[PDB]
Design a protein around this ligand. Structure first.
Ligand SMILES: Cc1ncc(COP(=O)(O)O)c(CNC(CCC(=O)O)C(=O)O)c1O
Ligand SMILES: Cc1ncc(COP(=O)(O)O)c(CNC(CCC(=O)O)C(=O)O)c1O
Ligand SMILES: [Cl-]
Ligand SMILES: [Cl-]
Ligand code: NA
Lengths: 370, 371
């Protein structure tokens, strides 16, 4: 009867209703709604969660990336290697600093930056690499780091889709990393509105960020540098604190589901599945499949009362937004292929097994018929 | 004794505790947190409130200004006349577009852009005028419009401290206006986090704005244009709807307190009282007095257990953020003078008469001291 929802947000509030309500009531009653104890508590907790020393809360994953770059001196004339395969914000953030986004294709087997391709894209104007741990899968960080070192580049990770994921046993955002996260409601760790953060081991970068996000000031009405307004609300921070506490458990639920999908969709002719890189603990922000006749598969599922989505329908390079400025069509085949064949299957910490089985059955069904 | 607070934010929540809590619960139960019915509802109401056709909720007053400018095609190589006397955000939004902020002094006695001075700063690079209705006082819109219309400049108003004010009987942001507002907790119209909006009578601008605040999208995943993320949460918007229904009333309270101060502090030696330009209905975001020896007066009130604030202690041009690109100290005397003379006295829809009365007494006392 009822459809399989793509991702149930309300279920996330439902599960922790009492604590959530109390957290909000608390904020409401504090009389402090910006840059207070909730933000400070969350930052500390998140940073620790991430196995690093600093966290700076902001308004969105897009701002975190932008401010991270700006904070590393990134600007006009600079080149930033970005994924040709990712959510547009990745590029926009770069574009926002005046810098130039230079797309690099994903590895042939994993939706992350291909390091060898990366190397070949590096030019004398390159100043930073911007790997995206797409769908909750970590990019080959050791290879990226080697490259960056060897070439004197910074590394800003787009971890908006990988909260709590591990790379070779270390969380994404650990140590000397510089990673941007999104707290958008639908992210693996979400709140009740827009939010984001930058995590880093660098106390200096951290401080620049604190100024950056707050009108370039550390002291009221003391504008030492040009800044903006990109803060994480206390109210949102409060909830985030609750949710963080449940992140590994929630994440584990997705992993189970992912294991279910992998086995249950194994063999299917014409249906490509995700190949987890070794030495990694992905967080399955999205469970993706690939096929020719993706459109037909979606309709089929739709018709079967299954909610689906495509991440993403148009490759960044081909969006009107960047059209006249990025590589021509056919010049980024992998991102292009992804756009035509990819489909996201319901997944989340509130999806019941029976519903995942329904999904599987319907996929097999279609797969089989075609 | 208990100090007199500068502006009590809790009191705002308290007064509407029940409605508030329920507006929030409602959002929580909706399963809808971004770009929903509360946003739409608040936009319609606000728009109607400002006597205009559209309202586009964003993340802050700065983004409102920025996005408006962007939407009007303002950018690099362009010039936007800004007030030398204002909150930094006004300049920052201009710079953010790659355009250039060109400071123009305010009147000598009114914290707004001096129309007479504007004209002279106009360059072939000029594209817009960015007047600020500072402290809840409207700038001279008629003059500015006239000026704009002549030179074919756009006008983007910084109305973050002027929610509901009227100029010539019309609300700030009415008709063909293009005005940006802030919903920052401490504004006349605030919420429990950051937020803002742009109001305009232009459907096309409005649509551009919706797209700009939402990744250059009108359809999910269809990036028609370059955009950003600058939205007003459902949760905050629910609250604003309530606050909005009490704005007139709350502003009204501010106006009573203003009258009191004005009457209560009349004829005081070195105390400069805020002037209310004719044809204006101010909303007194802030109550400002000016004096030489402001730090003294400040220390004095502090001693009398009264919280005050200075808006702003350092003129924009003199801030390190722009020091390097603005005019040198001494070349923007009005702005420089405001910065060294201003003091904000407690005011808000939650301040009580007796507290205001003590503010009055301390100020008088001070002013009457033997010299
Ligand atoms: C990889 C990646 N980077 C950056 C961002 C931007 O983060 P925000 O905090 O959401 O601004 C997203 C959000 N991806 C989204 C959410 C889009 C939105 O905010 O409207 C998505 O793909 O639906 C993302 O998935
Ligand atoms: C005249 C004016 N313009 C623009 C802004 C910026 O709007 P926001 O939504 O607050 O970004 C403010 C906020 N004035 C502030 C609040 C500064 C802040 O946001 O931290 C003030 O002067 O304290 C303002 O007063
Ligand atoms: Cl606050
Ligand atoms: Cl939502
Ligand atoms: Na926000």
């Amino acid at each position: 009867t009822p459809r399989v929802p793509f991702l149930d947000l309300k279920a996330a509030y439902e599960e922790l209703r009492a604590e959530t309500d109390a957290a909000i009531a608390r904020v409401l009653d504090s009389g402090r709604y910006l840059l207070g104890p909730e933000l400070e508590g969350f930052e500390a907790e998140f940073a620790a969660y991430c196995e690093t020393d600093h966290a700076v809360g902001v308004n969105s994953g897009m701002d975190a990336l932008q401010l991270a770059l700006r904070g590393l001196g990134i600007g006009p004339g600079d080149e930033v290697i970005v994924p040709s395969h990712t959510y547009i914000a990745s590029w926009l953030a770069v574009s926002a600093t005046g810098a130039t986004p230079v797309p690099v294709e994903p590895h042939e087997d994993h939706p992350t930056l291909d390091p060898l391709l990366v190397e070949k894209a590096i030019t004398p104007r390159t100043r930073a690499l911007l790997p995206v741990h797409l769908y909750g899968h970590p990019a080959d960080m050791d290879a990226l780091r080697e490259l960056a070192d060897r070439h004197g580049l910074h590394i800003v990770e787009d971890a908006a889709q990988a909260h709590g994921a591990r790379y070779r046993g270390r969380r994404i955002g650990a140590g000397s990393s510089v990673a941007a996260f999104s707290f958008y409601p639908g992210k693996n760790l979400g709140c009740f509105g827009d939010g984001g953060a930058v995590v880093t081991g660098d106390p200096e970068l951290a401080e620049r960020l604190r100024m950056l996000r707050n009108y370039g000031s550390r002291q009221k009405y003391s504008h030492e540098t040009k800044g903006t307004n990109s803060r994480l609300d206390e109210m949102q921070a409060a909830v985030l604190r609750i949710r963080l506490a449940h992140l590994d458990s929630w994440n584990g639920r997705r992993s189970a589901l992912a294991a279910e999908y992998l086995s249950g969709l194994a063999g299917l002719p014409g249906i490509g599945l995700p190949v987890t890189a070794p030495d990694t603990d992905p967080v399955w922000h999205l469970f993706t499949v690939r096929t020719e006749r993706r459109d037909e598969l979606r309709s089929h599922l739709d018709a079967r009362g299954i909610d689906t989505l495509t991440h993403y329908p148009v490759p960044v390079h081909l969006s009107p937004a960047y059209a006249g400025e990025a590589p021509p069509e056919g010049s980024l085949p992998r991102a292009e292929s992804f756009a035509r064949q990819v489909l996201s299957l319901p997944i989340g910490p509130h999806l019941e097994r029976p519903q995942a089985l329904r999904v599987i059955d319907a996929v097999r069904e279609w797969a089989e018929r075609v």
